[PDB]
Amino acid sequence: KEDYFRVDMLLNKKGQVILYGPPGTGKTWIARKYVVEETNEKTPGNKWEFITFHQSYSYEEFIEGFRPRIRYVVEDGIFKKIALRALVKGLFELEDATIGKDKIHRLYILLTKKEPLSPTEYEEYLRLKRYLWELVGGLPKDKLKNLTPKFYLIIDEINRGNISKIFGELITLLEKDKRLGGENQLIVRLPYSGEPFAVPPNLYIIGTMNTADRSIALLDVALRRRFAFIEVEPRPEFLEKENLKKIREKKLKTEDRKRLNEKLNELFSKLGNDNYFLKTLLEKINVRITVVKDRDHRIGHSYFLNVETVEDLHHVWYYEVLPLLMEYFYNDWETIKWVLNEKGKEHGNVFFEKLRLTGPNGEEAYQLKVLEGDAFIGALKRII
Amino acid sequence: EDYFRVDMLLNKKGQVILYGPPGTGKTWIARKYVVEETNEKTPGNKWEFITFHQSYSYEEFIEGFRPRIRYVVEDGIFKKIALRALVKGLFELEDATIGKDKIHRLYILLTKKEPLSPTEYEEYLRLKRYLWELVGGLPKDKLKNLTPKFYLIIDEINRGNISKIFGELITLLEKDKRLGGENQLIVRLPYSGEPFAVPPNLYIIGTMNTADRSIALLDVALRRRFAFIEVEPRPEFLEKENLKKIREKKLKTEDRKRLNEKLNELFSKLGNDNYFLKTLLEKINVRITVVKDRDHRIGHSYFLNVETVEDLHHVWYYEVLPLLMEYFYNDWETIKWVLNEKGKEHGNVFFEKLRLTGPNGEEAYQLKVLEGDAFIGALKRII
Amino acid sequence: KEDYFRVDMLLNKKGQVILYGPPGTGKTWIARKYVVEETNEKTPGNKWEFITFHQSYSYEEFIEGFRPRTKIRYVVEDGIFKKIALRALVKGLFELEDATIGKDKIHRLYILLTKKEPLSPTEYEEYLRLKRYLWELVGGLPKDKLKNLTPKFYLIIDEINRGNISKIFGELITLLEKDKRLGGENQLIVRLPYSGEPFAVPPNLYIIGTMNTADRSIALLDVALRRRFAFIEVEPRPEFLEKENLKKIREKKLKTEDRKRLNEKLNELFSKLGNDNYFLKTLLEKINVRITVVKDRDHRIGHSYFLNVETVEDLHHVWYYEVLPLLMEYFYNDWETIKWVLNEKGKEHGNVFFEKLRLTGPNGEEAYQLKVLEGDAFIGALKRII
Amino acid sequence: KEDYFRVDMLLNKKGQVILYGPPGTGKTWIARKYVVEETNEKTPGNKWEFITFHQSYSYEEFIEGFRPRTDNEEKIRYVVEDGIFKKIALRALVKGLFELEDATIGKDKIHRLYILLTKKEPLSPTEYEEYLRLKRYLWELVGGLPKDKLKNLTPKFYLIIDEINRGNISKIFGELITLLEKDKRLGGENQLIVRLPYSGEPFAVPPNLYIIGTMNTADRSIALLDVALRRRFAFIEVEPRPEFLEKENLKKIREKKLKTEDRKRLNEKLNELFSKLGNDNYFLKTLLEKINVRITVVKDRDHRIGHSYFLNVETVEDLHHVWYYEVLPLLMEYFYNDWETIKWVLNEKGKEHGNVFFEKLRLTGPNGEEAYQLKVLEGDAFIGALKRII
Ligand SMILES: Nc1nc2c(ncn2[C@@H]2O[C@H](COP(=O)(O)OP(=O)(O)OP(O)(O)=S)[C@@H](O)[C@H]2O)c(=O)[nH]1
Ligand SMILES: Nc1nc2c(ncn2[C@@H]2O[C@H](COP(=O)(O)OP(=O)(O)OP(O)(O)=S)[C@@H](O)[C@H]2O)c(=O)[nH]1
Ligand SMILES: Nc1nc2c(ncn2[C@@H]2O[C@H](COP(=O)(O)OP(=O)(O)OP(O)(O)=S)[C@@H](O)[C@H]2O)c(=O)[nH]1
Ligand SMILES: Nc1nc2c(ncn2[C@@H]2O[C@H](COP(=O)(O)OP(=O)(O)OP(O)(O)=S)[C@@H](O)[C@H]2O)c(=O)[nH]1
Ligand SMILES: [Mg+2]
Ligand SMILES: [Mg+2]
Ligand SMILES: [Mg+2]
Ligand SMILES: [Mg+2]
């Protein structure tokens, strides 16, 4: 648990992390696994939330916005609700005579309530929010710093939405010192409600993002200072035989797992008795992609994580890896054949066989050749 | 062949995209696979057919605010078909915590073509939040195999902004992230504030044109969720036996024999060559592949309905010669070389060179209409 | 005719057609003529519609979109295509004899579709449940009954390339293919995003596009849309500019005694041209081959510029106010090309259309001016171009 | 006149013309003069309209669009209101159906529709539905009328579109690419009735209505209209006329307006002007000819200087103001940071630091960057610098 430990450390130092890398690495997996292993709660709900950003995601659905529920009810977004839940659950365990635990528990029932709030209860929600935000501030900073029952928000594909538009006052408030209990503790007031709001130290944010798409890759340095940035690189050592066996023996603790570790034995013996076939295959593929495009368009290891037989590797190759490589290099046949290091040969057991016709201006072109059986493993052996 | 690989890749990945040039039967094999898999010939209960375009948003697809005077969160097409797949999968799932009457009322509210009344919309929201309270406590090994199979064919999936339309479906569509999967995700939707997760009951078959690169699926993160099947042009369907085997698999009556001799009247005029259209499309696709992209190849649907020589003349002069002149605009040498008539500037040729020559040295050609045996003699030159 | 049979054959075979070519070749003319000759109606409405694509259409104004309908209601309203493709389907279900077809409801749906008044707020949900009953009926019908609906409906989409068709034709990338129409071997019934009600293009309907191919900025670069249409190149025919063909074209509509004047007006024309019936024909030929060699083949001058020419003053006005500005707009400030199109490149300072200016610039460049020639010097200048 | 006769015959033969040329040649004035000579109305209103296309002119404000309008003075709603062209086309068609002798026309309906097209106030919702129903009756009525009735309509309506290229003419027109042709109008041979997108009601251009556009061909950022859009309009070149700037010619043009005793004042003011220009009655004429020929060889033919800048010139200081505020910013706008060419148009190329319009600065940049400064000349030096342009 090393990536687990660095997510655990950089959440307790920066307050919030972003798991970046190429598509196919373990970002969403390590985020969801870390949060269900810290909260001890397998589903989203009270103690943690899972959201996904997109271009149809705005400030009004994230922090607060007007909604006709008629008059305008200032409906809180998901961040305001999880931050208020984190603050109220932290003021549960915070023993103090000024904290009225009867009103704080009523605010926790009003925040936990999955039903839409009645207009008889929305005024109670506003009054208890005013009492909560007039409670803190009068609370000392050394008590507001230590809040035990931590809350987590996983913003998957965080670079998909306009984060500077979605995060409103959260550009300022998400810094660890600008949270509650910190030394530069800052409680700003919100536009649509007028109520003061500040991020508690009880709530952490684990973003994940892919760095392949550069049109949505974040460049706001003032936004990037709020987050730690954990690079989840492609790990081809997960595709070694014993490591792939140990990974696939996670949810396999029955006799069917006995049908698993022999199914790899049919696989890796057919690959040439090499326990490092997929490992060095993805290694050579990623190191050849890194030098012709970038390191952020590397093939992640989750393409070959579900490979159990040779036909599974054939389907992952011809329907997930080769269309991805042909979308990487559109009509650039020399570069994609260099990625498979087939730049010299034009025929034979090859993935792109040369057409026997050259253009009127000297242009040439290739053809996707579907290899099967030992010829396919022989062509994959050439990449290593 | 293609049916078996669609059935195989739809189970291990959960969603497939049939891509390729126009003309190859991607929508055909998607519709045929889904009708042969659901045993119903109309979209509706167990499968839906949609087509993405630029007026698809996240609101019309998953959920969005719509006034009905009360602004309510109207579920889009995917949330209706995903809740329908989840509820219909929770029908046959025998358990003690699943109240079958609420699940059945939710299925009646989901499969209702009439718009829901305000007395039934709140019941719909209550049954939805009961459903999402239910599957948040259900084990993984019971949700892993829901009994029916629901399909959503998204034809021309690349014509809309897919990463904008698939709002929370970038995360949830992965087979290891569906309900009952090894890493089960349940996102929180922004508009309703209600949780949501794609069941393993529901499969997606996208189709995609790859000739147009302005709508190319360049999102590397979104290409990981789908398995990408290339439906290539198959010129071997235009062989004289395969043309009779394909065109008689749609009709069942006596007039199939009227199909037969009309084909034999065709290929006797082409030069007694049973592989005339096959080698014609193969040679033309090799020319297009070497002078333009391989995604601009001519599909076989142009020549599948060719049954006489006049239909081949109409398909040539009104479907693929405007297509070739649109491929190579004012590049007369390249379209001249695609029909391999680069030296032939006169005679029985498709583009006769004008005798007049411009002042800066440029020369132009003229589309010549060939009929009868001269047209077949010009088509024999391409082979 | 010939082009009439071309449009008829390709529209029956394909379902949709696009008459494309240079401006002024009779694409809108042969489209409107074919549609008023098939459906015997001189005015759109019942059996056919005429629309024009441009950048202010969208999917909402063509298929369906949300609109306010009077309190106020947020009502999804069908566009022109959904209205005509429900009208063609419902009119096709009149002559279908079947037990499951409830014609008392189909006739009410036809009355609500052909209702020129806007729908009442108590008559709109009647139309909605009638559409729901219709799409429950059509999905239950066998394919052989929907294969050949009895009438024929036409939608002339003129200047089709001027709008963003891939944005406008939302589901119609899929549905316009004749195998995906109703009763086809591979029929498809999409679900529309705004309403949620299903939709499918009947075989009753026939869309006819016309396209300007002189403009390259709006051309059909979309290859997948070009499968759905047949493509008729409507070339400029200068053989219509002969004296006998002008007498056949111009004296066809006005069948009164004025033909006995009009041919007289033609006899003053070509005798002023040199007693040559092929003056305008070879003039348009030897201009369009110049436009074909120095520009693309589809920036050519259409024959509709010279069809209304009756006297030499009309030819002078058509030359100096319609096609010489057009040639000056083709080759803007490119004098050695527009002068070469009129094949007066070596000529200057005479009976010429572009007189050379006596001044030369500091970089050695020169520019010419437009010279207006009248009388017989203009005809001697036009005789040079031939 | 002759230009008005040319506009009249090309407008009767094509239905719509465009007066195109450089700025300041009087294309708007020629269009307005011809229209007020036709309809005999000094102001727009019933029989003719005047609009200006700008960059933000849209189809929604030209044919029909969802415009906000208040219902019962309480709340705004977006309803489909007709633009300028649809209102003037319905007005022309209804006014032509006034004098049309036919029995199928319900005149007491049609006249009411004319009132609903001529009231200069927003329609109340009680009568806006009446206006919609009368439009539906009108398009049901002309859908059965023969061609011989609708061919000849008795009045003549005009729509002047000043600066027609400054908008997106295809996007603003829309259905008017097809409808504006003389054969595609009402009562024509190939009569066409489109179906508009927003209101969903039919529409067709009457032959009653004519369009006279003006086109500034100097700029070319937004000036490119399509070839099919060139086909609909006749195109009338309005050149700069420097022969309007001769002393007797400028006298007759300035005296064509109403002047009781100020004609002799204009006479003694114009004799004061040309006596300082070297006793040359043709000085402004050949000045504009030399500067326009020198514009034509280096710039486009459409970039010439219009003659109406010098039509108000009566004194020497008026000519100095016109030069230093109306034609030298025009030249500096055409030749932006092209100093040798704009110096060659005035043919003072190489002649620096004299009685010059563009004085060369005596500094030079790090890599040889050069700059010129607009020098203002007053008195005999300005007339001397004007003398060497010729
Ligand atoms: N056991 C194990 N499984 C992993 C690991 N990394 C990825 N996986 C598996 O691969 C699948 C895909 O990984 P995932 O984390 O979802 O990619 P991603 O980072 O979200 O990809 P993207 O969203 O940026 S496109 C997951 O379902 C997970 O089960 C790992 O380190 N260990
Ligand atoms: N029998 C049979 N018919 C086919 C086959 N491939 C294509 N066709 C026919 O050709 C037509 C075109 O196939 P289609 O599915 O529409 O291509 P497409 O993928 O939609 O092409 P596009 O949308 O990218 S433009 C179909 O109507 C189908 O009937 C095939 O393999 N077998
Ligand atoms: N008789 C006859 N008349 C024609 C023919 N072509 C054009 N015309 C006449 O010329 C006029 C212009 O034709 P039109 O239909 O507008 O050309 P177009 O192809 O639409 O030109 P555009 O819209 O791209 S600009 C028509 O009104 C018609 O009367 C023809 O082939 N035969
Ligand atoms: N008497 C008389 N006045 C003229 C003549 N030409 C132009 N004018 C006057 O000069 C002024 C400018 O003319 P104008 O019509 O605006 O030219 P323009 O082509 O429209 O200029 P622009 O709009 O492109 S900048 C007008 O006020 C007009 O009255 C003319 O020939 N005779
Ligand atoms: Mg992810
Ligand atoms: Mg398709
Ligand atoms: Mg037209
Ligand atoms: Mg003006």
From TrEMBL, chain C:
It comes from the Archaea. GDP 2 binds at G24, T25, K27, T28, W29. Mg(2+) binds at T28, D158, E159. Residues 13-239 form the AAA+ ATPase domain. The chain holds residues 195 to 584 of 613 of the full protein. GO terms for molecular function: ATP binding; ATP hydrolysis activity; endonuclease activity; metal ion binding. GDP 1 binds at G24, T25, G26, K27, T28, W29, D179, H303. Keywords: Endonuclease, Hydrolase, Metal-binding, Nuclease. This is GTPase subunit of restriction endonuclease.
